[PDB]
Design an enzyme around this catalytic site. Structure first.
Site, PDB file in Angstrom:
ATOM      1  N   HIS A   1      44.919  24.404  13.084  1.00 49.48           N
ATOM      2  CA  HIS A   1      46.376  24.229  12.962  1.00 49.48           C
ATOM      3  C   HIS A   1      47.127  25.557  12.926  1.00 49.48           C
ATOM      4  CE1 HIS A   1      45.606  23.965   8.519  1.00 49.48           C
ATOM      5  NE2 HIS A   1      46.712  24.699   8.459  1.00 49.48           N
TER       6      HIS A   1
ATOM      7  N   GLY B   1      49.711  30.249   2.965  1.00 49.47           N
ATOM      8  CA  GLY B   1      49.085  31.470   3.429  1.00 49.47           C
ATOM      9  C   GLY B   1      47.588  31.525   3.151  1.00 49.47           C
TER      10      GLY B   1
ATOM     11  N   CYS C   1      45.335  29.145   3.832  1.00 44.55           N
ATOM     12  CA  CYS C   1      44.445  28.455   4.791  1.00 44.55           C
ATOM     13  C   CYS C   1      43.492  29.423   5.490  1.00 44.55           C
ATOM     14  CB  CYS C   1      45.267  27.687   5.800  1.00 44.55           C
ATOM     15  SG  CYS C   1      46.005  26.253   4.995  1.00 44.55           S
TER      16      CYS C   1
HETATM   17  C1  LIG Z   1      47.874  26.252   5.396  1.00 47.34           C
HETATM   18  O1  LIG Z   1      47.977  26.015   6.737  1.00 47.34           O
HETATM   19  C2  LIG Z   1      48.301  27.653   5.162  1.00 47.34           C
HETATM   20  N1  LIG Z   1      49.213  28.152   6.163  1.00 47.34           N
HETATM   21  O2  LIG Z   1      48.098  28.334   4.230  1.00 47.34           O
HETATM   22  C3  LIG Z   1      48.498  25.199   4.495  1.00 47.34           C
HETATM   23  C4  LIG Z   1      48.353  25.368   2.990  1.00 47.34           C
HETATM   24  C5  LIG Z   1      49.564  24.578   2.412  1.00 47.34           C
HETATM   25  C6  LIG Z   1      49.814  24.804   0.966  1.00 47.34           C
HETATM   26  C7  LIG Z   1      51.320  24.604   1.246  1.00 47.34           C
HETATM   27  C8  LIG Z   1      51.036  24.957   2.699  1.00 47.34           C
HETATM   28  N2  LIG Z   1      48.023  23.916   4.947  1.00 47.34           N
HETATM   29  C9  LIG Z   1      48.967  22.982   5.434  1.00 47.34           C
HETATM   30  O3  LIG Z   1      50.166  23.233   5.573  1.00 47.34           O
HETATM   31  C10 LIG Z   1      48.421  21.677   5.866  1.00 47.34           C
HETATM   32  C11 LIG Z   1      48.404  21.444   7.304  1.00 47.34           C
HETATM   33  C12 LIG Z   1      49.583  20.526   7.653  1.00 47.34           C
HETATM   34  C13 LIG Z   1      50.238  20.155   6.347  1.00 47.34           C
HETATM   35  N3  LIG Z   1      49.369  20.654   5.333  1.00 47.34           N
HETATM   36  C14 LIG Z   1      49.391  20.240   3.995  1.00 47.34           C
HETATM   37  O4  LIG Z   1      48.565  20.783   3.232  1.00 47.34           O
HETATM   38  C15 LIG Z   1      50.440  19.251   3.536  1.00 47.34           C
HETATM   39  N4  LIG Z   1      49.767  18.208   2.856  1.00 47.34           N
HETATM   40  C16 LIG Z   1      49.886  16.890   3.309  1.00 47.34           C
HETATM   41  O5  LIG Z   1      50.629  16.593   4.201  1.00 47.34           O
HETATM   42  N5  LIG Z   1      49.187  15.980   2.514  1.00 47.34           N
HETATM   43  C17 LIG Z   1      49.010  14.549   2.838  1.00 47.34           C
HETATM   44  C18 LIG Z   1      48.076  14.587   4.105  1.00 47.34           C
HETATM   45  C19 LIG Z   1      50.287  13.819   3.176  1.00 47.34           C
HETATM   46  C20 LIG Z   1      48.295  13.975   1.617  1.00 47.34           C
HETATM   47  C21 LIG Z   1      51.500  19.972   2.679  1.00 47.34           C
HETATM   48  C22 LIG Z   1      52.617  18.937   2.370  1.00 47.34           C
HETATM   49  C23 LIG Z   1      50.946  20.548   1.349  1.00 47.34           C
HETATM   50  C24 LIG Z   1      52.119  21.150   3.465  1.00 47.34           C
HETATM   51  C25 LIG Z   1      48.158  20.142   8.051  1.00 47.34           C
HETATM   52  C26 LIG Z   1      47.723  20.250   9.508  1.00 47.34           C
HETATM   53  C27 LIG Z   1      47.473  19.070   7.201  1.00 47.34           C
END
Ligand SMILES: *[C@](O)(C(N)=O)[C@H](CC1CCC1)NC(=O)[C@@H]1[C@@H]2[C@H](CN1C(=O)[C@@H](NC(=O)NC(C)(C)C)C(C)(C)C)C2(C)C
Ligand SMILES: *[C@](O)(C(N)=O)[C@H](CC1CCC1)NC(=O)[C@@H]1[C@@H]2[C@H](CN1C(=O)[C@@H](NC(=O)NC(C)(C)C)C(C)(C)C)C2(C)C
Lengths: 306, 306
Positions: free
Chosen positions: A41, A143, A145
């Site tokens: 991603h 950040g 990930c």
């Molecule tokens: C990493 O990509 C990163 N850039 O560090 C990130 C860590 C999170 C912690 C806040 C940002 N991961 C994501 O953004 C991850 C990627 C999208 C959305 N993500 C989520 O972790 C979301 N969770 C989510 O949607 N949870 C469910 C699936 C509804 C239960 C967040 C809402 C925390 C951003 C994808 C591809 C899953």
């Protein structure tokens, strides 16, 4: 003496962390030999996350769209491929700090160290257990990930986890280093449930052994139990069933203390039924399940790493 | 999100650990530039420990009686001196892995990472607070003496602790890197008492802030208090008095949450007077005091290190 939740020394893994940028997204990568591994991603916009077609998104990217930086120094990307939920970027330089390594799939109830990184820079280190529902309870901000989990056996780093996502209540999910999620999760920002979790009984018993080894023994009692009787209690309290395989794994700690596993089970049964009555064990007011038997043996015997 | 007790990445310190042997005693040393630092009781037999004259004991030793080994490779010792409770061995080679470093004296209530080592080999890493009674609660078996504590500010390692001894109930004591004990301790195997300890109030409040930041907020209430009123409660519960200096230090966490420090104090007062009623905060059933305000800010803002 003393008993602490302890991470592996992180130096061998620090030397493998890089920063990966694709368009607007910066996260961490793992550089081993001439390959950098990161969550796929990295290629997504915020809107793409909601319903990504990763095959179509990756087709829009070329080698020169992946910016890899190792400290201040840029790496040249000469190939890219997607394996499950990771991206592998082939670079023109083998990491000269590559440790002896393996990729392993960790089992539920086992532990590993996490090197939390941001912008390719290591921030801190802590231990996690893979929960029976294939989540971890970590500390991961935006950040983080691409931060990895690992174990060290002497000089060989076994990588077992790469961080991808968060579920409600600070619950974390990710993949092995072949990009296969632990658990039922998918890398899409859409409603998903983690399973009911359960307490890792063999780990609770290992930690009660650690407590006895460290002189904390108020909870020991005059009673015994059977595997069957204990397991009826385990089921009422959402503890995993104890098996003879687990009794056998607890052998070194039983031998060190002279306390038979089923006598320690009778102590655990009374702690579940009665609570702790405002007392503590190894500085905790709850029964702890994130220490494996090996974790307790290793710490209460002093194993080290080259 | 999530909040975990986290150590600094240990790689910069791993590159400084050596093994020091004098007669029958093997423990760890710290190799920086052309000096190795270790506890001076490396020179003692078991019987000497009971009532050592370290000046007389050291007179019986020459440079060639100190065996220093860095991995598999022997260092040549070209000088030795005693500074307080450490020995400094001058070697003929500067450690090529010497990081930017300082020696600091940590204050009570502050934290640091410990790299537990055995035979000069790093075993694991964990965080400690310097208790108000100048002890730490670590994990140190026989062979761990000479293991160090440190903090990392970007690329600079501030060494603050070297491990020497254990007091009853797994309580640990040691020195700064100039060999001065924290607390009243002496390096002799004779009866010694640690002071009454106290709970580090500013650290409890920082951890309640961490809890609110992570969505754990059941303990927030409709009440407020004053510094004076809170401090009468702190004194009944063996908490250190809260000062305006501590309120000021908590500013970034107050600003992040919008909860005034004295309103969080009113929550803490109710938790002390009523207990947790079988509930948890950030996975704990006790009030935690080993996270500083900086620890919570750094983790709940994502600071990293080169
Ligand atoms: C990493 O990509 C990163 N850039 O560090 C990130 C860590 C999170 C912690 C806040 C940002 N991961 C994501 O953004 C991850 C990627 C999208 C959305 N993500 C989520 O972790 C979301 N969770 C989510 O949607 N949870 C469910 C699936 C509804 C239960 C967040 C809402 C925390 C951003 C994808 C591809 C899953
Ligand atoms: C280190 O030297 C090492 N070799 O690793 C060692 C760590 C301890 C853990 C068991 C061995 N430190 C000591 O042995 C230390 C040295 C003697 C005795 N020491 C103690 O820690 C003793 N504690 C002690 O006597 N406590 C009081 C002072 C009575 C409260 C032990 C009984 C734990 C060995 C000296 C110089 C203090």
């Amino acid at each position: 003496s003393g008993f602490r939740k302890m991470a592996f020394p992180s130096g061998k893994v620090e030397g493998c962390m890089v920063q990966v940028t694709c368009g607007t997204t910066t996260l961490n990568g793992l550089w081993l030999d001439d390959v950098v591994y990161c969550p796929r991603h990295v290629i997504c916009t915020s809107e793409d996350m909601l319903n990504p077609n990763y095959e179509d998104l990756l087709i829009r990217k070329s080698n020169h769209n992946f910016l890899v930086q190792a400290g201040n120094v840029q790496l040249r990307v000469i190939g890219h491929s997607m394996q499950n939920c990771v991206l592998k970027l082939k670079v023109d330089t083998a990491n000269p700090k590559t440790p002896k390594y393996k990729f392993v799939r960790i089992q539920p109830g086992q532990t590993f160290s996490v090197l939390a990184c941001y912008n390719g820079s290591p921030s801190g280190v802590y231990q996690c257990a893979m929960r029976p529902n294939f989540t971890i309870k970590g500390s991961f901000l935006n950040g983080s990930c691409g931060s990895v989990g690992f174990n060290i056996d002497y000089d060989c780093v076994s990588f077992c986890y790469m961080h991808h996502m968060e579920l409600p209540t600070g619950v974390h999910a990710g993949t092995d280093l072949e990009g296969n999620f632990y658990g039922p999760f998918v890398d899409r920002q859409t409603a998903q449930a983690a399973g009911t979790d359960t307490t890792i009984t063999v780990n609770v018993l290992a930690w009660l052994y650690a407590a006895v080894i460290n002189g904390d023994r108020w909870f020991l009692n005059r009673f015994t139990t059977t595997l069957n009787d204990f397991n009826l209690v385990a089921m009422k309290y959402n503890y995993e069933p104890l098996t003879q395989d687990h009794v056998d794994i607890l052998g070194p700690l039983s031998a060190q203390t002279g306390i038979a596993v089923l006598d320690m089970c009778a102590s655990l049964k009374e702690l579940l039924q009665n609570g702790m009555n405002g007392r503590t064990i190894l500085g905790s007011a709850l029964l702890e399940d994130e220490f494996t038997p090996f974790d307790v043996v290793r710490q209460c015997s002093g194993v080290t790493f080259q």
